RNA sequence: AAUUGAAGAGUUUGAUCAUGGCUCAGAUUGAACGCUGGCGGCAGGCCUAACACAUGCAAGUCGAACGGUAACAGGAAGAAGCUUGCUUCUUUGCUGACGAGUGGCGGACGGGUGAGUAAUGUCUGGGAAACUGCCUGAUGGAGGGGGAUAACUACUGGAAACGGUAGCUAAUACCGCAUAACGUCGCAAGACCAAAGAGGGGGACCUUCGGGCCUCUUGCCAUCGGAUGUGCCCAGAUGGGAUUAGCUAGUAGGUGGGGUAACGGCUCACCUAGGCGACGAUCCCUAGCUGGUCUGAGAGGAUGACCAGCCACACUGGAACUGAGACACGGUCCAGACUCCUACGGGAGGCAGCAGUGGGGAAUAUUGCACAAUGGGCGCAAGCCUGAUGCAGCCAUGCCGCGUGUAUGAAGAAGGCCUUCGGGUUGUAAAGUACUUUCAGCGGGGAGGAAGGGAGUAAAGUUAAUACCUUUGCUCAUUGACGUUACCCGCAGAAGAAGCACCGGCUAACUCCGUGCCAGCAGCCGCGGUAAUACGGAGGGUGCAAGCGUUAAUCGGAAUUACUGGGCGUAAAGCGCACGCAGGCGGUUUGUUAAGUCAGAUGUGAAAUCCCCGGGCUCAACCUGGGAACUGCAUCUGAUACUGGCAA
């Protein structure tokens, strides 16, 4: 792997059109408090397999679509 | 650029001899010094801290005959340099050529010592330097140009030069009319009656 | 093709060149790839006046760079080994 | 507009017509192939391919379709024909 | 050694403390105006109308690709000017050369601008699916044919722009044919693709005396690399507004066809019904982004000229063609707006290149010189081109330097000014006296920016070679726009060279006369109605100086949007009260995780700038060496106290 991303699922309901939430904390660049800056990513998962609520590992591939530059690697947990 | 105006007037307002008629007579009088720098000079200038602060730097300025602009840059350079800003300021001021020409005696007053500089009648380490603000450094060697040597002025110049307390930081002939800026004058040389920290304050806010 | 040439960062009447490796198509004082020397032609006989990291110049001419005409002189004027 | 390389203008037309004809004739021979695939004729399909292969490869060499453009076409066609040929 | 640096004042009140705005001292400017104006160095110079443009110039070059001669230069069998060696025309392209044409390479660079663009952008850090002219490594290629055509000749239409016929001809133009692997398709077997010559010198030998032949150079074809350039994808960051809360049908995804140099809803067909959105979509408004620039002790605030990087645009809208590269700044085509030419039928053009013009404005320069340098195009070269550039001209617009004189000069003149008339002041100031001559003027001399290229010659690399070619010496004759250059010497005579604002308090500097709530002043307070230090003039003084004031503008002081660093009983401020979604926060224990946090390593954070230490221009501004710094971002590996996640 050249880096990997984790994140929860958020949306499985679409022929491989899987989108994943990623969560970082970051120091507010002005008032120093730490807030939640979320990222959604449109990831590929051949033969649809993850489900809403799954934690999942993900990696940056080339463009699979205007939107998709990431496939999944592994799954982790279910039935949240 | 040069002051050019009746020059005792200054010493009188500044209340002290700035040695601007330097020449012959000493401890002024034969002038009027003090009790009427103008038409109301007679009066007591009970004056703000700003004023005493103002007049000090003015005094220092009317002395080396330096105009505001240049003096500011002196201050700024002084402050840039590590060391007491006020000392550093006094250092730079002395480092002036024209000054280190009157100080070696070749010229009656700094004004005269200057006319010499501008009139290409001086040579540092051999070469002719006709700009009054040429900063002089340790070990330097300021001479008089052979052309126009022992000419008028420069005699009486090197004369009463010995009447004066007389430097230390600089050794200097008198026959050749050459002389060597040996070191950067220390605080303790020169001064007494000048108050840096005031003219540091004038330029601090 | 890339080239070794003099940029003129002088100052009216007292030129002082940087010597740079860059896309020959760019401006004489524009984007470059890396700096590889300098050349003060008013050097004065005092000290310095034409420092020149040869072992880089080398590298690029290996990678296909052409050299100016002036620079070519300087290199064959630095002598080379002494 | 008045400057020597008016010449260039009139030049790029000579070029343009040249490439225009060879560029069409080429896509014709290419068409003849996809025609047979839509038809069903596996033989005419190969027959078409074998006469267009050189002229593509060839055009590329000459440089109005430089490299891989040809490739794709062969690759594509080849798949198609023996997909059911 | 290298950010080691922070100040307050005036003004509400009779007075006070608090609260709180207003104002002021400071830095900064691509500035303008008013008065004034001596010289030089560096720099800056349409901020407005991305308004419109007369004229010149801003891109060509190669005869060592090609047929070539029209110009001028020579030469030539031979015809001659004849004044028998000096030479004239018919002609002849014979070569030096070269208009026009074909061809090659460059016109995608350099230079202009900030319109559009809140993201095909920019900055940071990364990723995989691609092409890449010239330059460069490697390995082989480079056979043998064919039909054209511009030029030109003849005829011919137009005022012009520029055309119509018919021929006629060369090549590095063009096309077959061969050849075909470490290339392309293909699991394989197999199938399939290319090219161009041109010079330089040369022993036999000899040829149709043109050359073969030898020989070196240079270009040409193919494949894989490099180098550089460019295309593309992801994430974060990069203005404002809810008096905009919903947005979306190629929309989101899949499958296949097509397409691109390349991944891809890029496109299509068909299927799924998705995709975005309060962590602010959509809509609206404004805007090129960066490095950095100004300010501030910092944190911030403000800003994006001049220098460098990226993007974007080239009269307006739209298109593609050529090409390695363009959807092309001085290319093409269509539409539009607008302008020019005309013989009235038709043509032509785009300054946001340089200069210049009109227009707008408070305001922003010469229709200059030169390729000498550096850099770029082409050429083997010599060279040609280069408003890039290097210089010059204009403006105190700014920065920096310098000068306009230096010493001496008293009972201290004259005049002015104040005065209790005693005197004070202007004032060592003037005059007088000695002295100096920078700068400007004048006259002499005279660096550097110059490397190289040209011939010779010498050796070496080659080769048949001592020829050519390339490389390295040697000598000789040379090459500067700036330029009356820098700098140097002499010449004359203080000779040509001082102004502007201020003086009630803040705030450095006081009197008189005039005026009388008038004329007027004023940054704030506030001055003016008979003694005005505040109006106007004068004497004197203070402040700055070839500048000085005024206006405009940013930040500062303002802890007056308070993150650092503030407040809400009565001064601005607790919603009339409650319940509660989202959101924020959350007792106590153990285990686990390693996201927040912390540590280290690596890479990256362009150069310039800033700063420290030096170096070079007589100093300085300016120029430059080298460090330091860029407080950031990412990757990897670790640490587990705190926070977050999971468990109990
Ligand atoms: Mg000055
Ligand atoms: Mg396909
Ligand atoms: Mg009151
Ligand atoms: Mg005037
Ligand atoms: Mg020609
Ligand atoms: Mg705009
Ligand atoms: Mg060809
Ligand atoms: Mg073949
Ligand atoms: Mg052939
Ligand atoms: Mg597809
Ligand atoms: Mg502050
Ligand atoms: Mg410009
Ligand atoms: Mg267009
Ligand atoms: Mg093309
Ligand atoms: Mg134009
Ligand atoms: Mg113009
Ligand atoms: Mg006007
Ligand atoms: Mg120019
Ligand atoms: Mg009198
Ligand atoms: Mg002179
Ligand atoms: Mg020279
Ligand atoms: Mg020299
Ligand atoms: Mg006062
Ligand atoms: Mg006034
Ligand atoms: Mg009165
Ligand atoms: Mg503040
Ligand atoms: Mg408060
Ligand atoms: Mg209240
Ligand atoms: Mg209440
Ligand atoms: Mg706890
Ligand atoms: Mg840097
Ligand atoms: Mg120095
Ligand atoms: Mg815990």
Swiss-Prot record, chain A:
InterPro entries: NA-bd_OB-fold, Ribosomal_uS17, Ribosomal_uS17_bact/chlr, Ribosomal_uS17_CS. Changing residue 28 to P: In neamine-resistant mutant nea301. GO terms for biological process: cytoplasmic translation; response to antibiotic; ribosomal small subunit assembly. It holds the Pfam family Ribosomal_S17. One of its GO terms (cellular component) is cytoplasm. The keyword Nucleotide-binding does not apply. CDD domains: Ribosomal_uS17. The strain missing both S17 and L29 grows very slowly and has a rather unstable temperature-sensitive phenotype. Part of the 30S ribosomal subunit. One of the primary rRNA binding proteins, it binds specifically to the 5'-end of 16S ribosomal RNA. Also plays a role in translational accuracy; neamine-resistant ribosomes show reduced neamine-induced misreading in vitro. This is Small ribosomal subunit protein uS17. It comes from Escherichia coli (strain K12).
UniProtKB/Swiss-Prot annotation, chain B:
Disulfide bonds: none annotated. CDD domains: S4 (cd00165). The keyword Mitochondrion does not apply. InterPro entries: Ribosomal_uS4, Ribosomal_uS4_bac-type, Ribosomal_uS4_CS, Ribosomal_uS4_N, S4_RNA-bd, S4_RNA-bd_sf. One of its GO terms (molecular function) is rRNA binding. It comes from the Bacteria. SMART domains: Ribosomal_S4 (SM01390), S4 (SM00363). GO terms for biological process: cytoplasmic translation; DNA-templated transcription termination; maintenance of translational fidelity; negative regulation of translational initiation; response to antibiotic; ribosomal small subunit assembly; ribosomal small subunit biogenesis; transcription antitermination. GO terms for cellular component: cytoplasm; cytosol; cytosolic small ribosomal subunit; small ribosomal subunit. Residues 95-155 form the S4 RNA-binding domain. Keywords: Antibiotic resistance, Repressor, Ribonucleoprotein, Ribosomal protein, Ribosome biogenesis, RNA-binding, rRNA-binding, Transcription, Transcription antitermination, Transcription regulation, Transcription termination, Translation regulation. Changing residue 50 to D: In rpsD101; suppresses a temperature-sensitive mutant of release factor 1, R137P. Not a ram mutation. PROSITE patterns: RIBOSOMAL_S4, S4. HAMAP family: Ribosomal_uS4_B. NCBIfam families: PRK05327.1, rpsD_bact. Belongs to the universal ribosomal protein uS4 family. PANTHER family: 30S 40S RIBOSOMAL PROTEIN (PTHR11831), SMALL RIBOSOMAL SUBUNIT PROTEIN US4M (PTHR11831:SF4). This is Small ribosomal subunit protein uS4. It comes from Escherichia coli (strain K12).
Swiss-Prot record, chain C:
PROSITE patterns: RIBOSOMAL_S16. GO terms for cellular component: cytoplasm; cytosolic small ribosomal subunit; small ribosomal subunit. InterPro entries: Ribosomal_bS16, Ribosomal_bS16_CS, Ribosomal_bS16_dom_sf. GO terms for molecular function: DNA endonuclease activity; four-way junction DNA binding; structural constituent of ribosome. One of its GO terms (biological process) is ribosomal small subunit assembly. Keywords: Endonuclease, Hydrolase, Nuclease, Ribonucleoprotein, Ribosomal protein. Induction: Part of the rpsP-rimM-trmD-rplS operon. Belongs to the bacterial ribosomal protein bS16 family. HAMAP family: Ribosomal_bS16. In addition to being a ribosomal protein, S16 also has a cation-dependent endonuclease activity. Part of the 30S ribosomal subunit. This is Small ribosomal subunit protein bS16. It comes from Escherichia coli (strain K12). The lineage of its organism: Bacteria, Pseudomonadati, Pseudomonadota, Gammaproteobacteria, Enterobacterales. The gene is rpsP.
Swiss-Prot record, chain D:
Keywords: Ribonucleoprotein, Ribosomal protein, RNA-binding, rRNA-binding. Residues 1-24 are annotated as: Disordered. One of its GO terms (molecular function) is structural constituent of ribosome. Pfam families: Ribosomal_S20p. SUPFAM superfamilies: Ribosomal protein S20. It comes from the Bacteria. InterPro entries: Ribosomal_bS20 (IPR002583), Ribosomal_bS20_sf (IPR036510). One of its GO terms (biological process) is ribosomal small subunit assembly. One of its GO terms (cellular component) is cytosolic small ribosomal subunit. Part of the 30S ribosomal subunit. Belongs to the bacterial ribosomal protein bS20 family. Binds directly to 16S ribosomal RNA. This is Small ribosomal subunit protein bS20. It comes from Escherichia coli (strain K12). The lineage of its organism: Bacteria, Pseudomonadati, Pseudomonadota, Gammaproteobacteria, Enterobacterales. The gene is rpsT.
């Amino acid at each position: 792997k050249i880096r990997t991303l984790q994140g929860r699922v958020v949306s499985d309901k679409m022929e491989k059109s899987i989108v994943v939430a990623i969560e970082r904390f970051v120091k507010h660049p002005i008032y120093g408090k730490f807030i939640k800056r979320t990222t959604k990513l449109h990831v590929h998962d051949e033969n649809n397999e993850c489900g809403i609520g799954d934690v999942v590992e993900i990696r940056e591939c080339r463009p699979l679509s205007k939107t998709k530059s990431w496939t999944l690697v592994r799954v982790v947990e279910k039935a949240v | 650029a040069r002051y050019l105006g009746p020059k005792l007037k200054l010493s009188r307002r500044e209340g002290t001899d700035l040695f601007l008629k330097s020449g012959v007579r000493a401890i002024d009088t034969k002038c009027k010094i003090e009790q009427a720098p103008g038409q109301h000079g007679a009066r007591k200038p009970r004056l703000s801290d700003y004023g005493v602060q103002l007049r000090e730097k003015q005094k220092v300025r009317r002395i080396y005959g330096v105009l505001e602009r240049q003096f500011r840059n002196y201050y700024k350079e002084a402050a840039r340099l590590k060391g007491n800003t006020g000392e550093n300021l006094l250092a730079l001021l002395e480092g002036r050529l024209d000054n280190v020409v009157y100080r070696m005696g070749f010229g009656a007053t700094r004004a005269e010592a200057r006319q010499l500089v501008s009139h290409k009648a001086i040579m540092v380490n051999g070469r002719v330097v006709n700009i009054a603000s040429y900063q002089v450094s340790p070990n330097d060697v300021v001479s008089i140009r052979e052309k126009a040597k022992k000419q008028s002025r420069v005699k009486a110049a090197l004369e009463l030069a010995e009447q004066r307390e007389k430097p230390t930081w600089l050794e200097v002939d008198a026959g050749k009319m050459e002389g060597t800026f040996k070191r950067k004058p220390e605080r303790s040389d020169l001064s007494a009656d000048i108050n840096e920290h005031l003219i540091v304050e004038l330029y601090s806010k | 093709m890339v080239t070794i040439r003099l940029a003129r960062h002088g100052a009216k009447k007292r030129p002082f060149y940087q010597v740079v490796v860059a896309d020959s198509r760019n401006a004489r004082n524009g984007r470059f790839i890396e700096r590889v020397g300098f050349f003060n032609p008013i050097a004065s006989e005092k000290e310095e006046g034409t420092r020149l990291d040869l072992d880089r110049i080398a590298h690029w001419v290996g990678q296909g760079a052409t050299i100016s005409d002036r620079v070519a002189a300087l290199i064959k004027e630095v002598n080379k080994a002494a | 507009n008045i400057k020597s390389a008016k010449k260039r203008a009139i030049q790029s037309e000579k070029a343009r017509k040249h490439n225009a004809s060879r560029r069409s004739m080429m896509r014709t021979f290419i068409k003849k192939v996809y025609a047979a695939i839509e038809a069903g004729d596996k033989a005419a399909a190969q027959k078409a391919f074998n006469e267009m292969q050189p002229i593509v490869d060839r055009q590329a060499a000459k440089g109005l379709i430089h490299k891989n453009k040809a490739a794709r076409h062969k690759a594509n066609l080849t798949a198609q024909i023996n997909k059911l040929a």
